[PDB]
Scaffold this active site. Structure first.
Site, PDB file in Angstrom:
ATOM      1  N   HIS A 102       0.888  -1.166   0.037  1.00 52.95           N
ATOM      2  CA  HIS A 102       0.008   0.053   0.038  1.00 52.95           C
ATOM      3  C   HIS A 102       0.793   1.091   0.079  1.00 52.95           C
ATOM      4  O   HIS A 102       0.243   2.357   0.384  1.00 52.95           O
ATOM      5  CB  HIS A 102      -0.947   0.144   1.325  1.00 52.95           C
ATOM      6  CG  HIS A 102      -1.774  -1.222   1.419  1.00 52.95           C
ATOM      7  ND1 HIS A 102      -1.643  -2.193   2.528  1.00 52.95           N
ATOM      8  CD2 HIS A 102      -2.866  -1.741   0.879  1.00 52.95           C
ATOM      9  CE1 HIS A 102      -2.245  -3.033   2.358  1.00 52.95           C
ATOM     10  NE2 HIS A 102      -3.167  -3.067   1.409  1.00 52.95           N
TER      11      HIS A 102
HETATM   12  C1  LIG Z   1     -10.825 -16.993   9.449  1.00 51.51           C
HETATM   13  C2  LIG Z   1     -11.234 -16.029   8.255  1.00 51.51           C
HETATM   14  C3  LIG Z   1     -10.857 -14.407   8.303  1.00 51.51           C
HETATM   15  C4  LIG Z   1     -10.033 -13.815   9.272  1.00 51.51           C
HETATM   16  C5  LIG Z   1     -11.855 -13.753   7.321  1.00 51.51           C
HETATM   17  C6  LIG Z   1     -11.527 -12.345   6.944  1.00 51.51           C
HETATM   18  C7  LIG Z   1     -12.120 -11.722   6.133  1.00 51.51           C
HETATM   19  C8  LIG Z   1     -12.083 -10.409   5.589  1.00 51.51           C
HETATM   20  C9  LIG Z   1     -12.659  -9.723   4.655  1.00 51.51           C
HETATM   21  O1  LIG Z   1     -13.832 -10.507   4.059  1.00 51.51           O
HETATM   22  C10 LIG Z   1     -14.970 -10.454   4.756  1.00 51.51           C
HETATM   23  C11 LIG Z   1     -11.845  -9.438   3.571  1.00 51.51           C
HETATM   24  C12 LIG Z   1     -11.593 -10.625   2.508  1.00 51.51           C
HETATM   25  C13 LIG Z   1     -12.467  -8.326   2.556  1.00 51.51           C
HETATM   26  O2  LIG Z   1     -12.382  -7.116   3.370  1.00 51.51           O
HETATM   27  C14 LIG Z   1     -13.839  -6.621   3.603  1.00 51.51           C
HETATM   28  C15 LIG Z   1     -11.351  -7.927   1.506  1.00 51.51           C
HETATM   29  C16 LIG Z   1     -12.390  -6.776   0.502  1.00 51.51           C
HETATM   30  C17 LIG Z   1     -10.115  -7.745   1.600  1.00 51.51           C
HETATM   31  C18 LIG Z   1      -9.497  -6.773   0.347  1.00 51.51           C
HETATM   32  C19 LIG Z   1      -7.921  -6.976   0.455  1.00 51.51           C
HETATM   33  O3  LIG Z   1      -7.329  -7.960  -0.509  1.00 51.51           O
HETATM   34  C20 LIG Z   1      -6.081  -8.065  -0.705  1.00 51.51           C
HETATM   35  C21 LIG Z   1      -5.730  -9.477  -1.244  1.00 51.51           C
HETATM   36  O4  LIG Z   1      -6.634 -10.158  -1.950  1.00 51.51           O
HETATM   37  C22 LIG Z   1      -4.140  -9.511  -1.533  1.00 51.51           C
HETATM   38  O5  LIG Z   1      -4.073 -10.635  -1.967  1.00 51.51           O
HETATM   39  C23 LIG Z   1      -2.799 -10.327  -3.169  1.00 51.51           C
HETATM   40  C24 LIG Z   1      -3.512  -8.830  -1.042  1.00 51.51           C
HETATM   41  C25 LIG Z   1      -3.933  -7.454  -0.089  1.00 51.51           C
HETATM   42  O6  LIG Z   1      -2.846  -6.548   0.247  1.00 51.51           O
HETATM   43  C26 LIG Z   1      -2.109  -5.840  -1.066  1.00 51.51           C
HETATM   44  C27 LIG Z   1      -5.093  -7.083  -0.111  1.00 51.51           C
HETATM   45  C28 LIG Z   1      -5.696  -6.087   0.635  1.00 51.51           C
HETATM   46  O7  LIG Z   1      -4.825  -5.275   0.979  1.00 51.51           O
HETATM   47  C29 LIG Z   1      -7.191  -6.074   0.989  1.00 51.51           C
HETATM   48  C30 LIG Z   1      -7.697  -4.812   1.734  1.00 51.51           C
HETATM   49  S1  FES Z   2       2.021  -0.618   3.316  1.00 53.85           S
HETATM   50 FE1  FES Z   2       0.197  -1.763   3.462  1.00 53.85          FE
HETATM   51  S2  FES Z   2       1.479  -3.450   4.321  1.00 53.85           S
HETATM   52 FE2  FES Z   2       3.190  -2.042   4.007  1.00 53.85          FE
END
Ligand SMILES: C/C=C(C)/C=C/C=C/[C@H](OC)[C@@H](C)[C@@H](OC)[C@@H](C)CCc1oc2c(O)c(OC)cc(OC)c2c(=O)c1C
Ligand code: FES
Ligand code: HEM
Ligand code: HEM
Ligand code: HEM
Ligand code: HEM
Ligand SMILES: C/C=C(C)/C=C/C=C/[C@H](OC)[C@@H](C)[C@@H](OC)[C@@H](C)CCc1oc2c(O)c(OC)cc(OC)c2c(=O)c1C
Ligand SMILES: CCCCCC(=O)OC[C@H](COP(=O)([O-])OCCN)OC(=O)CCCCC
Ligand SMILES: CCCCCCCCO[C@@H]1O[C@H](CO)[C@@H](O)[C@H](O)[C@H]1O
Ligand SMILES: CCCCCCCCO[C@@H]1O[C@H](CO)[C@@H](O)[C@H](O)[C@H]1O
Ligand code: FES
Ligand SMILES: [Sr+2]
Lengths: 428, 179, 256, 428, 256, 179
Positions: free
Chosen positions: F144
């Protein structure tokens, strides 16, 4: 079905939800069903089974967070749970012994139904749905036992997949398809894990229909006399609402059952297990004292009772031109024993529902119950004399009860008159 | 007439085919994968095997028994008459499929010293216990009580057939090629 | 094969209130290291668990020194190094010597009657009793039926039931006459083979019981925690059951 | 509760079954519900979503028979599927691309609702259940993407579990609990597999309630005018039975959707993927071109748009005495964007249901649709100028739409008259 | 870092009806074995797959002979032995040489425009194009900005975008001026470095394309099967869609 | 009277306690297991590290950066005034928790040559790219867009804090003990 009063929203939040999704109305009509007043302590095993299914699922899911379905890691990963994971030893023992409690409950549940005629009309669907659940439980419990990859795990999986190899023509094809190769290896472990996870959810779906089935007809009671339905006045004299009267009695009984269960898990968690499953799977040697899990022993005893020397096997082989040999006969007998129990609504020709008022039936039922315990006991013995005969006599009676005694009993027996109503029996 | 009736058939017929084409790969993925189907052969060192010793070796994920039979084992095996056997077929991949289950047709060599067979009970796949076990001086399967004799022929129990003998032959004085 | 007789040892950890004797477990660890480890491994026991509560509970510096004696091949480096507490005990040095990590649970000493299982219900599975019986059950003279028929490289043991037996030691149906059978393990113990620091006696009896307790802990390190949980659950459910009984009773009063 | 004709058993098997378990009666009244005649092609995405859930589950179960959730074996086991398992390459690509189809369908499904007012009363429960399903899908899809253990798998799991670390006070405890250690390792992979298996069944359970919710009220239609309920005569002029008229139309649309979908999977299966996930996880280095899965990009763009330099972030930090820094603000903004969409039934104050008859609403709605595409595009760009500003303006409009425009629109707009009935619109 | 320009090679396997050229894959295997294998491994490719249909399709006896050249450590024995067809290609001999099993899918050669992804939609991901460009993109002279600043042990490559770049090759904002950057891989190819048996030309151009095709098959061995399935599935659903259209249309006729 | 009213409270209260005792172990099993909690220390050979090289080492399942900083890196780090930093805390386990983020308090030695820190971006845990990257002659996190300077201090982006420095000390001329 039974005459009763219905739900009415009172709070503003309830009026809002009920006019959009009547889920509260459904929970009310479900939990307030008028249930016969005269249910005894044999009606608790339904709630115990429900708890077990929830216990197994939550402990199962938790165990799967730390278990690795790979032959090089499976056994080691279970010891990792036992030794390193916070509370892992207790969750493992709860899941393992919980399976035993699960099966203690079904057998009492089943024999309750067989005694009181809970399978007879209009309750055939409940019984058949129950039989499907029972097959899924055994298949589920089988695959669970393979996952630790001990000696009993590995060789039980070889044998049980081998059952399908006994089918003429297509048997070897099915076996290779189940195995993923010529013999039990890693491909088998990986797929048993996925199917062990899936089936408990299928069981849960069946239980919903199971619950839906006897809610449509209403619960049976020890007298076999149905609730009067001509008016709410006399329907209420035969029944009380499920909540609170029977919720609390079930929860109470459950607390006593779980009290005992947690004493087992806490103080003798391995009594109902086989010590040889604490030895890693060795595909080049079968243990001398291999024995199935105790809840499999009656059906195991039935299968191996039918050797090439048994007269009825030799007749089957001759009439079938060799297609039905001792191998396939034993597999047919084992699954056939389960099938005849599924067909019992159409084999029991007596119109009297409850076995309490059937003098001759009582004798043969308790012989079947005794036979089932005997079958369990001989399952753990050697195949030498006299156990080979005990298992033949025991196997013979199981099929005779459903296929001969019960049809004949319904056209000869002179039953006693049951009470006029449930109310009469309750006050007595 | 039957012009709009045929459309409802042709549509449903196409849907059935499409479903079948989708269901088959869901079934066929459980059949042996390419690493498994790539069956391989092995060589077994035999110089260390004295008479009366059974060597148990893994081959294609299953046990193969290589027993150097003693004099007693060989005599007992040849004394059994064909009409006394449960299964009278040799079950031997190295010779004709119709060969009789004589002790001679159960060994790789003419002297009958080397008994090579799958150590997989023909009932439900357990591994019979050797070292002259059972009631016929051979093997005993502890899973449901099958007894095999000194040539690996089924004599008692639920198992329908003699233990199968794989393709096996001495490549030289001391090496057997299995498969 | 079959079941047999084991010597009913009174182990401290038996009974619902049974607990490990800390000093006994330490003596058993000394026996394992000095005697059993030459052939047997414990590949599932982390060395660090000797410090964990409910076991020998050795100071972490002693355990660190103990781990040093093992030569472990580091996974990434691939070169040999001294052992750490995070390593497991080594595999069995002797290829046919079974791993002892779970031996005390993978053997049953109590069987029957007539395969009913009532014996185990009251006496337990009997694994550490079995181990003790094997260490104790080596007689100097074999049974008379095998005076000139002993297999070379094997030894008669009273409690071992899975071994081979000479033809002269079988009855008319081929069932063995002897109480036990011939085991491939030579007698590992002998009076005062180990020198305990506190001067505790090192007879074959004492060492066999001490090391059997250690092998029970290695198999069930959380034994004490499991019982504590059992007691807690039982007291909870006892109270809850009583309260649920009175509630159920006081409810149905307005019905019957 | 639309006026309609009810089930009547005809076959002897139906009379027998109906008096025991009325499951056929339930399927009849369900599949024959009178549905508005005037549904257009935007009403198909519900059936597509249903197919996807079934497609994902069956391909998932099959894939789970050959996959190993262990860091040393996971990636290798996926290549084993691709190369060795019969049809494994196709089942893998179907599951991966199937997730993309699943999300294309929800976004069209959601924006259909946002245009036609399918969230407005009496359909609040349907919308919230939909939102719960939507949260479950994202959590499910997230954990699935971690399972191959590629570079995108590993670092996405680090980042997404890090979201919970941003909660003041308790954040680090939750993060360690999710991780099973100080950082992302094997314990995390093992538990994500179990939860990835479980949640699709929860979605299926939610979908059942989802289906129950809009069956109770009846489907919305493009005009926003409800079906006349005063008599069966005029209910039938507004409706046709779901089966066959709309079953076949849905199956037709599905066949066309799957035709396109199978062309993608067959001929460009990696277009919607990230090439860096074909590189094994390296816990000591983050790829330079790490980018989320395309269906996560709009919410990712929102989170990272709120840096320490953003003015509104600096106000939050000052007023909150430092509690709300840029890190936690971005997480609140990201989850807040989803939350305001869940609250839209209570923020849209206009009484006109369908946006077709709301002239000003159309402008701001299509800006939101354009904004969603814009948000998707900036998510894949660098954080340098001008993309940092584009994401602030785009993020700002998303919250303005729900929190400012929609409340204000319902007290200013002059809507056009809708049709008198569904019949009028259909005949036109 | 960022994306860059790749030479748009016309590979036979591109397009919906594209298929591998059997002889080209064999030539690429020869290039890989004689040049690339010195540093790069393919630990996910089974050696036996050279016989499978849809690839080089070498006779199974040749593949068995080919496997011999590798020295594999047997898992049970632990001692070295000759390779079998059931073994995978070895790991990278050179520790920092990445595995090439999936390289042709783990790299994108086509990017943009303005990060819209339309280029990949029409030209593909471009992994083998990227690989080809790296093998092709070694110039004899470096960029003028680094005439006396080349890092020792590194080499300028036109297509490589993830390498370091001298300070004199960055603009006022620190973004690199050069089309590519410096890669640790020395130029692997050179005219007629490989002697093809059939006399096919072995220029750097030909060998780079041949080995890029081989590395595409190694990454997607089931590529041809996947397209066949696509055609079949597309033809099924086309017929079914047409039939479902007529059914849906002829049904609603009695409504509107 | 209030005799059966207290029972219905006591009963429900007992049920609540029993439930809580059952739910906690289902949660606590996901917390770090005993093998994880058994934190361990390591030693890094450093004799081979020239100025301008960053060594990245795994410690407790996460990256640790050991960079031998160049002359330019050290000069740049000392030239930054405290009021120009996003996060003014040293985030250094080896000294007081309240120490200021001066370049001197960010290195193990007084000369400021040895920068040892967790290579874990303080935003959402990605690993920043070194080799003098970003806009402040330090590290750039590609997830980010956080920029760190030559002392690893956060200067730009969403990350709230400077990269933390673990317990680290030179055991001899060439070996650092982490933890
Ligand atoms: C045991 C289960 C657990 C703890 C579940 C948790 C679920 C959380 C949320 O879902 C409800 C979450 C998936 C949802 O947030 C609203 C998405 C929009 C998240 C978006 C998301 O994706 C990334 C990603 O895919 C990546 O891959 C290469 C890498 C990333 O960094 C660069 C990200 C990332 O920075 C973010 C914000
Ligand atoms: S800047 Fe978001 S993880 Fe390092
Ligand atoms: C997970 C397994 C099962 C669960 C959770 C379950 C649940 C229940 C419950 C809660 C009841 C009502 C209370 C009671 O009578 O105990 C019930 C009744 C019944 N069940 Fe089951 N059951 C299971 C398995 C089975 C099986 C295996 C059978 C038969 C083979 C069966 C047949 C019946 C019958 C006949 C009744 C009586 C219904 C009536 O009185 O109308 N069930 N079950
Ligand atoms: C009716 C439901 C279930 C039954 C009867 C059942 C039964 C069993 C049994 C008997 C074992 C062997 C335990 C042992 O050998 O000590 C086992 C193992 C296992 N089961 Fe289940 N199970 C059920 C549900 C589940 C579910 C839903 C999961 C979900 C992940 C699961 C996961 C596991 C795992 C991971 C193991 C291996 C760990 C262990 O052996 O304890 N189980 N199961
Ligand atoms: C697995 C995910 C989903 C499935 C299988 C599903 C399925 C369906 C189906 C079949 C319909 C009826 C046909 C139609 O209107 O398209 C429907 C209606 C609807 N769904 Fe969903 N849906 C899903 C997700 C969602 C989501 C994510 C939302 C909102 C955030 C949502 C909200 C709605 C609404 C507002 C309606 C209209 C109901 C009405 O017209 O009365 N659904 N859904
Ligand atoms: C709503 C339902 C589901 C969604 C959205 C979903 C999504 C995903 C995604 C996007 C991946 C990554 C695929 C890749 O990186 O190529 C994945 C992996 C995986 N999922 Fe699912 N999944 C679902 C249901 C299931 C179920 C029910 C199971 C198991 C019974 C399952 C088992 C797997 C497995 C084994 C993998 C690893 C293999 C692979 O990467 O293709 N999935 N999932
Ligand atoms: C992918 C899923 C598959 C293929 C599921 C198959 C399910 C089959 C049946 O369940 C429906 C089956 C479990 C059920 O038969 C009715 C049991 C009563 C089988 C009883 C059974 O157990 C054994 C066992 O446990 C062993 O362990 C140590 C060893 C065994 O040999 C000695 C047996 C055995 O000889 C028999 C007959
Ligand atoms: C991300 C897209 C979201 C679209 C949501 C939606 O409900 O679409 C609005 C219009 C419906 O057209 P209309 O009833 O205004 O009548 C006017 C129709 N010409 O739908 C269309 O224009 C249909 C095709 C849209 C696909 C992008
Ligand atoms: C309803 C209450 C049932 C109580 C069952 C207690 C069974 C105790 O069982 C005892 O446990 C000891 C410790 O686990 C074992 O060492 C003994 O062998 C065993 O007999
Ligand atoms: C509904 C019909 C849609 C047809 C979509 C066809 C998409 C073809 O896509 C092509 O696939 C080739 C095969 O690998 C790739 O090499 C090309 O890069 C790609 O453009
Ligand atoms: S399995 Fe060998 S006898 Fe039944
Ligand atoms: Sr005792």
């Amino acid at each position: 079905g039974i005459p009763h009063d219905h739900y009415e929203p009172r709070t503003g939040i309830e009026k809002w939800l009920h006019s959009r999704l009547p889920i509260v109305a459904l929970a009310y009509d479900t939990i307030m069903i008028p249930t016969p007043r005269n249910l005894n302590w044999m009606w608790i095993w339904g709630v115990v089974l429900a708890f077990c299914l929830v216990l197994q699922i939550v402990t199962g899911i938790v165990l799967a967070m730390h278990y690795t379905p790979h032959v090089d890691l499976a056994f080691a990963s279970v010891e990792h749970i036992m030794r390193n994971v916070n509370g892992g030893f207790m969750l493992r023992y709860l899941h393992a012994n919980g399976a035993s409690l699960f099966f203690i409950a079904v057998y009492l549940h089943i024999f309750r139904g067989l005694y009181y005629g809970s399978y007879k009309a209009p309750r055939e669907v409940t019984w058949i749905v129950g039989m499907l659940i029972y097959l899924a439980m055994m298949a589920t419990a089988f695959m669970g036992y393979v996952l630790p990859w001990g000696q009993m795990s590995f060789w039980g999986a070889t044998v049980i997949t081998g059952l399908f190899g006994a089918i003429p023509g297509i048997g070897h094809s099915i076996q290779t398809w189940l195995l993923g190769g010529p013999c039990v290896d890693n491909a088998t472990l990986n797929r048993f894990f996925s199917l062990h996870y899936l089936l408990p959810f299928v069981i849960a779906a069946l239980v919903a229909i199971h619950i839906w089935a006897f809610h449509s007809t209403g619960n049976n009671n020890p007298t076999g006399v149905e609730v009067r339905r001509t008016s709410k006045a006399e329907a209420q004299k035969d029944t009380v609402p499920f909540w609170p009267y029977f919720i609390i009695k079930d929860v109470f009984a459950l607390a006593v059952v779980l009290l005992v269960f947690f004493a087992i898990v806490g103080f003798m968690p391995n009594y109902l297990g086989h010590p040889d499953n604490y030895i890693e799977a060795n595909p080049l040697s079968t243990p001398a004292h291999i024995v199935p899990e105790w809840y499999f022993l009656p059906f195991y005893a039935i299968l191996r009772a039918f050797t090439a020397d048994v007269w009825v096997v030799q007749i089957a082989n001759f009439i079938s031109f060799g297609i039905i040999d001792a191998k396939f006969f034993g597999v047919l007998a084992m699954f056939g024993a389960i099938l005849v129990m599924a067909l019992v609504p159409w084999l029991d020709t007596s119109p009297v529902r409850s076995g309490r008022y059937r003098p001759m039936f009582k004798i043969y039922f308790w012989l079947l119950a005794a036979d089932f315990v005997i079958l369990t006991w001989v399952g753990a013995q050697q195949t030498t004399f006299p156990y080979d005969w005990i298992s033949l006599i025991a196997s013979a009676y199981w099929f005779a009860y459903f296929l001969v005694i019960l049809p004949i009993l319904g056209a000869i027996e002179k039953p006693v008159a049951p009470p006029a109503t449930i109310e009469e029996d309750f006050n007595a | 007439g039957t012009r709009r009736d045929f459309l409802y058939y042709a549509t449903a017929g196409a849907g059935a085919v499409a479903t079948g084409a989708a269901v088959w790969p869901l079934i066929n993925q459980m059949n042996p994968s390419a690493d498994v189907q790539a069956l391989a052969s092995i060589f077994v060192d035999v110089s260390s095997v004295e008479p009366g010793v059974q060597l148990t070796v893994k081959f294609l994920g299953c046990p193969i028994f290589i027993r150097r039979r003693t004099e007693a084992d060989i005599e007992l095996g040849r004394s059994v008459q064909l009409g006394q056997l449960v299964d009278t077929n040799a079950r031997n991949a190295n010779i004709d499929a119709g060969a009789e289950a004589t002790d001679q047709n159960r060994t790789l060599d003419e002297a009958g010293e080397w008994l090579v067979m799958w150590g997989v009970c023909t009932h439900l796949g357990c591994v019979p216990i050797g070292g002259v076990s059972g009631d016929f001086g051979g093997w005993f399967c502890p899973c449901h009580g099958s007894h095999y004799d000194s040539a690996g022929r089924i004599r008692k129990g639920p198992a329908p057939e003699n233990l199968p003998i794989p393709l096996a032959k001495f490549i030289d004085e001391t090496t057997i090629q299995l498969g | 094969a079959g079941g047999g007789h084991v010597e009913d040892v009174p182990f401290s950890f038996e009974g619902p209130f049974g607990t490990f004797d800390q000093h006994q477990l330490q003596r058993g660890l000394q026996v394992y290291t000095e005697v059993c480890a030459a052939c047997h491994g414990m590949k599932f026991v982390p060395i660090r668990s000797l410090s964990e509560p409910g076991g020998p509970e050795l100071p972490e510096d002693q355990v660190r020194a103990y781990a040093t004696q093992f030569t472990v091949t580091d996974e990434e480096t691939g070169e040999d190094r001294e052992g750490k507490p995070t390593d497991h005990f080594p595999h069995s040095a002797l290829e046919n010597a079974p791993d002892l990590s779970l031996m005390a649970k993978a053997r049953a000493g109590f069987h029957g009657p007539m395969g009913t299982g009532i014996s185990q219900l009251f006496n337990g599975i009997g694994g550490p009793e079995y181990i003790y019986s094997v260490l104790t059950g080596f007689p100097e003279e074999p049974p008379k039926c095998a005076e000139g028929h002993e297999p070379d490289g094997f030894y008669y043991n009273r409690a071992f039931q899975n071994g081979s037996v000479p033809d002269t030691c079988k009855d008319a149906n081929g069932v063995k006459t002897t109480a036990g059978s011939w085991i491939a393990m030579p007698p590992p113990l002998m009076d005062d083979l180990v020198e305990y620091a506190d001067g505790h006696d090192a007879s074959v009896h004492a060492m066999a019981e001490d090391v059997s307790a250690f092998l029970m802990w290695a198999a069930e390190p959380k034994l004490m925690a499991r019982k504590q949980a059992g007691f807690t659950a039982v007291m909870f459910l006892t109270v809850l059951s009583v309260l649920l009984y009175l509630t159920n009773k006081r409810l149905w009063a307005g019905v019957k």
